[PDB]
Amino acid sequence: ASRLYTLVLVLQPQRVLLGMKKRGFGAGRWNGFGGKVQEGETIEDGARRELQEESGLTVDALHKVGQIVFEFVGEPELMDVHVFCTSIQGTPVESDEMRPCWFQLDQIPFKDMWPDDSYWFPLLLQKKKFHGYFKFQGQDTILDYTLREVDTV
Numbered sequence: 001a002s003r004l005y006t007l008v009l010v011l012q013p014q015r016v017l018l019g020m021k022k023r024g025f026g027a028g029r030w031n032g033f034g035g036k037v038q039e040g041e042t043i044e045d046g047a048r049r050e051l052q053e054e055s056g057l058t059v060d061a062l063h064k065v066g067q068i069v070f071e072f073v074g075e076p077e078l079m080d081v082h083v084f085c086t087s088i089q090g091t092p093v094e095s096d097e098m099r100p101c102w103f104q105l106d107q108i109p110f111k112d113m114w115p116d117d118s119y120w121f122p123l124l125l126q127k128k129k130f131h132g133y134f135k136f137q138g139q140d141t142i143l144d145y146t147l148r149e150v151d152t153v
């Protein structure tokens with residue numbers, strides 16, 4: 001009972017782009033860019049499409065960096081999130097849904113991000129690949145988790 005999602009991190013040598021979500025689920029937190037994979041679409045094509053819809057950026061080469069499953073206690077559907085890292089074109093676009101901002105790598109706003117990010121961002125920043133699972137109670141509490149580095153996602 002899992003649904004496919006993507007998440008894209010635009011990570012440059014000294015900064016990362018994140019978007020402040022204005023509405024819907026996750027509003028008020030800085031996030032990568034992502035959403036649901038569509039019918040007939042590959043996961044990677046979904047990742048490229050969502051980065052444009054949410055940030056206005058065009059990505060050619062995407063690299064898969066992780067897979068994280070999110071469980072919300074009581075909720076039937078698990079989120080199977082395929083995480084990718086990016087060479088981009090365009091300038092980030094602020095829209096009604098998302099306010100993008102560049103962050104220096106020592107200024108990541110973990111306090112205003114989903115709590116799981118604190119666990120897997122140190123891996124992302126060090127160019128590691130990973131598999132994770134986080135079980136949440138509500139939006140603020142991690143009940144339990146697993147996180148492992150892998151050679152292949």
Ligand SMILES: CNC(=O)c1cnc2cc(OC)c(OC)cc2c1Nc1ccc(Cl)cc1F
Binds near residue numbers: 006025026031036114
């Ligand atoms: C830079 N880290 C993130 O951006 C990020 C981190 N953790 C998340 C945890 C979540 O629930 C437990 C979650 O539920 C909607 C969203 C998360 C999330 N963003 C995100 C946005 C849109 C999708 Cl489709 C998928 C995502 F993971």
